[PDB]
Amino acid sequence: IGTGFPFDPHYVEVLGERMHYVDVGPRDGTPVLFLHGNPTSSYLWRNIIPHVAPSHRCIAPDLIGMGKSDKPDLDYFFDDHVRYLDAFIEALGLEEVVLVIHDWGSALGFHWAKRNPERVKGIACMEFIRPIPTWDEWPEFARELFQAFRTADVGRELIIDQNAFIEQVLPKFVVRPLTEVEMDHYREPFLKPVDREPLWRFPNELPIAGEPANIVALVEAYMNWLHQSPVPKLLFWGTPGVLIPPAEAARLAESLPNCKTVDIGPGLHYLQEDNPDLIGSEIARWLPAL
């Protein structure tokens, strides 16, 4: 598994802030837009993109306040990310797209898809955000941790002061051991504690136990759209998973229209770090059929 990030940097100005993105592959057909989540960046996609780039344009932005993108003094609510991503897509003059999405990147992607259904040609997804009705549906191996993340004072102490989302959550949710080089790549955006605001707000935006109500409503909305959309879908899952356990992937395999599922083997949350070659190769095999 490659530790390097051999991609020329690109920046586009979005609402007075520069957003970094990877942009490789041929420029004529439909682009594949890769959307990371918390606490990652386009670095998450580094070993997946090379399978896809030979045949298709790969665009992978770093979300505002993350990766190599500018870091405005925002609250970094989900709605903030929505506004910047909406503006990024229009800034590049993208028409139709294929989405490849994960975690908060999936919330963003699905919400964009619901609002622009005519412009989405396919969705490849993995460990995506769905309503979590109770904490019983959250893996026992991370229940107290994320409960603490959403507790007053304690949450900020763990995520901001101690950098728990980088130093604990990342290794905890990758089955194979991450190298020091890989950790340093993930560390680089958040060397300054103050810049960890998005890493704390994201877990506090998760639709868990009916709160926050607005996000629950929004996620329910795009899941309702997804369940009745004819757009081709490719769902990657792992055992035992985090957001999408095997049993959930099985239900989605039946319920989601026009959906193919791919079992990546052992996986938690950052499936891209466990089996990037299978994820990349399957996306590549899938795209020409769109």
- 205 among known catalytic residues: no
Per the structure block, which two tokens stand in for 112?
């964009």
Mention every residue, 6+ apart, whose C-beta is less than 8 A from residue 157. none
Residue identified by tokens 């960046």 is 41
CA-nearest of 248, 49, 62, 266 to 173 is 266
**Environment class of 177 (CB within 10 Å of its CB; exposed 0-12, middle 13-18, buried 19+):** exposed
**Environment class of 212 (CB within 10 Å of its CB; exposed 0-12, middle 13-18, buried 19+):** middle
Per the structure block, which two tokens stand in for 169?
């959550």
Query: Of 51, 111, 269, 273, which residue is the catalytic one?
Result: 269
Q: Report resolution in angstroms.
A: 1.8
233-240 and 259-267 strand pairing: parallel
Question: Cβ atoms within 10 A of the Cβ of 213, count?
Answer: 9
CB 175, CB 122: distance < 8 Å: no
Q: With both helix axes pointing from N to C terminus, report the angle between 78-91 and 104-115 in degrees, rounded to the nearest 10.
A: 60
Query: Of 80, 103, 182, 274, which residue is the catalytic one?
Result: 103
- 227 among known catalytic residues: no
Nearest 10 degrees: Cα torsion 50, 104, 67, 162: -130
- 36 among known catalytic residues: no
Q: Does domain 9-289 bear CATH number 3.40.50.1820?
A: yes
- The experimental method behind these coordinates is X-ray
Distance set, CA 170 to CA 39, 89, 176 (Å): 8, 28, 11
d(CA 55, CA 238): 27
Per the structure block, which two tokens stand in for 11?
């920046």
**Environment class of 95 (CB within 10 Å of its CB; exposed 0-12, middle 13-18, buried 19+):** exposed
Residue 171 has phi, psi (to 5 degrees) of -55, -35
Domain boundaries, the chain: 9-289
How many residues are there in the chain?
Answer: 290
Residue 202 has phi, psi (to 5 degrees) of -55, -55
Q: Is 15 left (phi over 0), alpha (psi -120 to 50) or beta?
A: left
d(CA 121, CA 113): 10
